[PDB]
Ligand binder design. Structure first.
Ligand SMILES: CO[C@H]1O[C@H](CO)[C@H](O)[C@H](OCc2cc3ccccc3oc2=O)[C@H]1OC(C)=O
Ligand SMILES: [Cl-]
Length: 137
């Protein structure tokens, strides 16, 4: 698939929706980003950074009216340059739940509450993207 890739989420997200992204991190990658969007707002930005001051960190945040909010940072970093990955995002009633390579990684409490209006997922960064799909569990 071509990156950046836009995956429509028809009628928005709902609890029990599972999104699966398969790809390979490029050698010498700098960043990956998943952006769940509500129009111009970003309800959930998930942003692995491979070199922030010589550390690897995952930054999560929300953008409202063009302004970024308070960051939530995770130091557990399961991505590896050059290697294949699987990201699964499970929508639960109170948070997005993220697993990488079948291991739980983090939860992100819903700040944007109109879940039915979060109707696009943007996938970008230094990856080769193999597939991006959703199903209901
Ligand atoms: C406060 O802004 C930083 O932190 C934000 C999260 O709190 C975003 O990750 C944002 O990134 C959004 C962003 C970065 C980007 C980088 C390359 C290409 C396209 C990009 O599109 C973006 O929205 C960051 O901004 C910078 C300089 O990386
Ligand atoms: Cl809202």
């Amino acid at each position: 698939l071509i990156v950046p890739y836009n995956l429509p989420l028809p009628g928005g997200v709902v609890p029990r929706m599972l999104i699966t992204i398969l790809g390979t991190v490029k050698p010498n990658a700098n960043r990956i980003a998943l952006d769940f969007q509500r129009g111009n707002d970003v309800a959930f930005h998930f942003n692995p950074r491979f070199n922030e001051n010589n550390r690897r960190v995952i930054v999560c945040n929300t953008k409202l009216d063009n302004n970024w909010g308070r960051e939530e940072r995770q130091s557990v970093f399961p991505f590896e340059s050059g290697k294949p990955f699987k990201i699964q995002v499970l929508v639960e009633p109170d948070h997005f739940k993220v697993a990488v390579n079948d291991a739980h990684l983090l939860q992100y409490n819903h700040r944007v509450k109109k879940l039915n209006e979060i109707s696009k997922l943007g996938i970008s960064g230094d990856i080769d993207l193999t597939s991006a799909s959703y199903t209901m569990i």
